[PDB]
Amino acid sequence: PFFPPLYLGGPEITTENCEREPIHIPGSIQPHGALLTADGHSGEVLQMSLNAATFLGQEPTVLRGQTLAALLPEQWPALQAALPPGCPDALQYRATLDWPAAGHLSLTVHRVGELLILEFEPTEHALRNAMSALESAPNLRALAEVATQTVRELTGFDRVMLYKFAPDATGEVIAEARREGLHAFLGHRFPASHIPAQARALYTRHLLRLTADTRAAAVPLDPVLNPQTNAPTPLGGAVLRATSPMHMQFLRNMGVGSSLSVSVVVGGQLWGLIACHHQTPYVLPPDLRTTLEYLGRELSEQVQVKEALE
Ligand SMILES: *C/C=C1/C(=C/c2[nH]c(/C=C3[NH+]=C(/C=C4\NC(=O)C(C=C)=C4C)C(C)=C\3CCC(=O)O)c(CCC(=O)O)c2C)NC(=O)[C@H]1C
């Protein structure tokens, strides 16, 4: 059972309790975007990342308590209609905003219970071709190789691996596409503890996560608890959520500045990950993550199909 989070007096995580870190409720985000939470009926802004006012060019005193009706007059009606009470928390509303201070922004919203969680991130044929290349791959090894190469072409990531889970939850790199000069991980195996049980569980439900800068400090939400509930804000579905410090350290020690993975789910089980690295920090574009999500779904389908062919 999970430890309390750090802001509720929980311990700093160590290697004796990796599996007890409540990674879904860090009460903080990555600094390359901003996060607001809002009441699902009134649109009152209930929580904001500490960088939100600066990120959005708003006056801090105005921002909290403000309504989405006032902050987002052009999206609020659409947002309400798209995300009514009781909808799947996987359901998304997305809009592109031309924000004077911030530039071109992507807004992604989902509902958890009575709370709307709004993520603002800068934004900046290929999909169909990629989907068809996966389809047309003749066997599982070729499928793995095509998936890693295609994802690398689309993203420009220094390394893209297909990381397959064994029944004991150890992991193996079974294909990779890599920048010239990077050492090979192909065929290397890693302990189950490096992607602990609660992470593997989360990754069965929320299929993409990333760390854009492995040296960046997390930006707290304020207030840290959802005022509706006096309880933690569920961020398992927020790509902006802070990454486990233990994992961030693991990445820095690998010389990885940016990391992103996409779940491969076969028969409702976590089969593996498309796992990506960059040496420098790197914010992968939002619509481009959408493409990666589609490719993850296609790969998951094709792994099942290819495993059936044998
Ligand atoms: C004591 C806890 C530990 C720990 C925790 C931890 N690890 C993750 C997430 C990931 N770990 C990954 C592992 C690898 N990436 C690689 O490139 C290789 C090897 C070539 C390995 C073994 C991966 C891929 C992830 C997924 C996230 C990503 O793609 O960057 C988490 C969950 C992080 C989060 O979602 O907040 C946690 C808590 N890792 C350890 O090594 C020990 C110290």
Curated annotation (Swiss-Prot):
Q: Which residues form a coiled coil?
A: none
Q: Identify the residues that the record assigns to the GAF domain, covering every copy.
A: 139-303
Where does this protein hold a tetrapyrrole? 18
Residues covered by the PAS domain: 20-88
Write out the PTM section of this UniProt entry.
Contains one covalently linked tetrapyrrole chromophore. Lacks the cysteine conserved in plant phytochromes (at the position of Met-246) that binds chromophore. An engineered sequence used for X-ray crystallography forms a thioether link to biliverdin through Cys-18. The natural sequence can bind phycocyanobilin and phytochromobilin in vitro, but the identity of the natural chromophore is unknown.
- Impact of mutating residue 276 to A? Binds PCB (in vitro), but has aberrant spectral properties
Spell out the family assignment given in the record's similarity comment. Answer: In the N-terminal section; belongs to the phytochrome family.
Function recorded in the entry: Photoreceptor which exists in two forms that are reversibly interconvertible by light: the R form that absorbs maximally in the red region of the spectrum and the FR form that absorbs maximally in the far-red region. Also has a slight blue shift for the far-red maximum. Could also absorb green light. May participate in regulating pigment synthesis like the carotenoid deinoxanthin which could protect the bacterium from intense visible light.
List the protein's name: Bacteriophytochrome
Biological source species: Deinococcus radiodurans (strain ATCC 13939 / DSM 20539 / JCM 16871 / CCUG 27074 / LMG 4051 / NBRC 15346 / NCIMB 9279 / VKM B-1422 / R1)
